[PDB]
Amino acid sequence: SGFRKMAFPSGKVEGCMVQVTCGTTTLNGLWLDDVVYCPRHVICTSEDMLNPNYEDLLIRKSNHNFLVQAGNVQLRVIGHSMQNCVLKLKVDTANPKTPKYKFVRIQPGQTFSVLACYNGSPSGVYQCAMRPNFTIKGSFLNGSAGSVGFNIDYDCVSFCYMHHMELPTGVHAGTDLEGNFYGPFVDRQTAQAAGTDTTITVNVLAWLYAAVINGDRWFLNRFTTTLNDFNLVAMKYNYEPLTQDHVDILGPLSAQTGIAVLDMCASLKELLQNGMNGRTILGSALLEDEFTPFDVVRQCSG
Amino acid sequence: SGFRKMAFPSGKVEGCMVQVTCGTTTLNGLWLDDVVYCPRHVICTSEDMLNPNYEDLLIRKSNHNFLVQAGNVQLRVIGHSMQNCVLKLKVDTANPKTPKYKFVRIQPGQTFSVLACYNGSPSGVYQCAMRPNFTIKGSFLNGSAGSVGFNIDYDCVSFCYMHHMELPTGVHAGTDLEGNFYGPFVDRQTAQAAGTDTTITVNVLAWLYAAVINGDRWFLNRFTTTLNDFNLVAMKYNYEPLTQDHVDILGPLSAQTGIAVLDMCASLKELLQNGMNGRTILGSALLEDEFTPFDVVRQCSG
Numbered sequence A, B: 001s002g003f004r005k006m007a008f009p010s011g012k013v014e015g016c017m018v019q020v021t022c023g024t025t026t027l028n029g030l031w032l033d034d035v036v037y038c039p040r041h042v043i044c045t046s047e048d049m050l051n052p053n054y055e056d057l058l059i060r061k062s063n064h065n066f067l068v069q070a071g072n073v074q075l076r077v078i079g080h081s082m083q084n085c086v087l088k089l090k091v092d093t094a095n096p097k098t099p100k101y102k103f104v105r106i107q108p109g110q111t112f113s114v115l116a117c118y119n120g121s122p123s124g125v126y127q128c129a130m131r132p133n134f135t136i137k138g139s140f141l142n143g144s145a146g147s148v149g150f151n152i153d154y155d156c157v158s159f160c161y162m163h164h165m166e167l168p169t170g171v172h173a174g175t176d177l178e179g180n181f182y183g184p185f186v187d188r189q190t191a192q193a194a195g196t197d198t199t200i201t202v203n204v205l206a207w208l209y210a211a212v213i214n215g216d217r218w219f220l221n222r223f224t225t226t227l228n229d230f231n232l233v234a235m236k237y238n239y240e241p242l243t244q245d246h247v248d249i250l251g252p253l254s255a256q257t258g259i260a261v262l263d264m265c266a267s268l269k270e271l272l273q274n275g276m277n278g279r280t281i282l283g284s285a286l287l288e289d290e291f292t293p294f295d296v297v298r299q300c301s302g
């Protein structure tokens, strides 16, 4: 038993991380087969960052303007192109440590592990969720762009995120691996702000089930509600509406605990209206929304 | 910016994880050079677990009673011995992926990453602290024994923990890699309980500095206190006494923020006496004590 913010093991991804330098700008790249993927703003200088024309900036470079290192081994750039907001650097050597992989775009509410990197070297791993406003609450310093987010399905690494930049509120924004931003952001230093965030209701319910499984039952009650009555109070507290697909997804957790989904919604409803009043759930004094139903099953069953 | 519960990248350790079976009991082992280390209770059956004599149980086995697999490759056991509460299985092949490593015993308050494993296969990575009562609040299911805790210093993996068992309160107990238990626990199914836990004061102070660094300043004040006056109120709330060595260790964080350690103790003192009163710090509504001063420097500076 127990419950932790658990990341996927990062070994398969650590072998794909490289350093990319162009000019006086160094960041991280992802080396799969014979292509290195990195954020396109590596080709920027400081005078370009307010309003760059990446088309012009790219045509003024040649393959030898890009320094790519895998540890101490240097990689020879033999071609480059831009795909949306990423650069694709064709290199002369295929990464022998290339895992089976795919490129997926995730939806708000889903979670993934982030391998934070500096100068091509993995520094730490942590778990986060894609927020309803398409930002992530990450931990990133200067030079972290090109760090990637991933899930592991069986033996296949699904890459879903590449880090680009930090917003003024301290949250983070990035692209999928095809270079398309999550959210309404662009990689130029203009004033941009995220939309208002909301709480991911289905994730809070999953976490309450994890609590029950681990012996925390004080918030339960005998009542029940309906999807419409619950959704009515949820809007008041900036919680995401709950759909029947969500109820279905919570099925295995309902079964394992013998507590119906709509029973659990009744407990949540009362928690929102009266607070925790000095009690904790799974060691937290706030309702946690960054565990999916699948995260909970994976940790509380295997 | 941002602040996350960040684990070390696990690649170096994933390559050392193997499956060990003896009888109908399968758990994990750690394969370094030509030795596999695993919890000694792998040689137990269910009738032995209440009061095992591991000396007798071990003499009744031969090398062929131990099945050791590294993925699909089988490892040939050519010798075995017991070191305190671990088994050392000599095998015919040296692990080619053996990192530079050392075996260290950690002190209450220090943190480490845990690579949770089942059937020799890495499942997840998370960060935890060794509690003042020598337990850890982990996340472990059946079959997780032999999972290891580690830190990474430069290129060297320091192994500090091997998991053995779960206490009735849902917390976890294990050994260093020489087989010596942390805490007053023994690997037999007798009633044992942990001592009372306390809050790791130096870690709470480090985390308040992380908050200041990330823009959370509402709990600060102009007051100051002394080590003796602070330590007097800390005892009342089950906080660990603060020593001058702790003050020294917090030096770099004092310098970076321009807030003296004893200034920050004055803020903590007032937080303990009046609570947070509906406010959060770094996204938490409780005082967090599982980040060391070094964790904070590593994440908020590099």
Ligand SMILES: CC(C)(C)[C@H](NC(=O)NC1(CS(=O)(=O)C(C)(C)C)CCCCC1)C(=O)N1C[C@H]2[C@@H]([C@H]1C(=O)N[C@H](C#N)C[C@@H]1CCNC1=O)C2(C)C
Residues within 6 Å of the ligand: A027, A041, A044, A049, A140, A141, A142, A143, A144, A145, A164, A165, A166, A167, A168, A172, A185, A186, A187, A188, A189, A190, A191, A192, A193, B001
């Ligand atoms: C360094 C800043 C945080 C100030 C910057 N952010 C903005 O310019 N934000 C915004 C404008 S604004 O703030 O309204 C104002 C105009 C400045 C008031 C623009 C982007 C959307 C949101 C608002 C930024 O991150 N930039 C600017 C250049 C790169 C990218 C960068 O350096 N990436 C890092 C690497 N490698 C990773 C970073 C570093 C810290 N932690 C991380 O995640 C870039 C090309 C975006």
Ligand SMILES: CC(C)(C)[C@H](NC(=O)NC1(CS(=O)(=O)C(C)(C)C)CCCCC1)C(=O)N1C[C@H]2[C@@H]([C@H]1C(=O)N[C@H](C#N)C[C@@H]1CCNC1=O)C2(C)C
Residues within 6 Å of the ligand: A001, B027, B041, B044, B049, B140, B141, B142, B143, B144, B145, B164, B165, B166, B167, B168, B172, B185, B186, B187, B188, B189, B190, B191, B192, B193
């Ligand atoms: C399965 C139990 C949790 C009930 C068990 N715990 C105790 O027997 N606790 C204690 C007695 S007691 O509870 O007071 C009572 C007498 C039962 C009332 C004894 C140990 C100190 C504290 C109290 C246990 O863990 N055992 C028993 C056999 C192994 C070890 C084991 O199976 N290890 C797992 C593997 N692989 C990893 C586990 C599984 C879940 N998550 C994990 O971490 C073992 C040889 C210790």
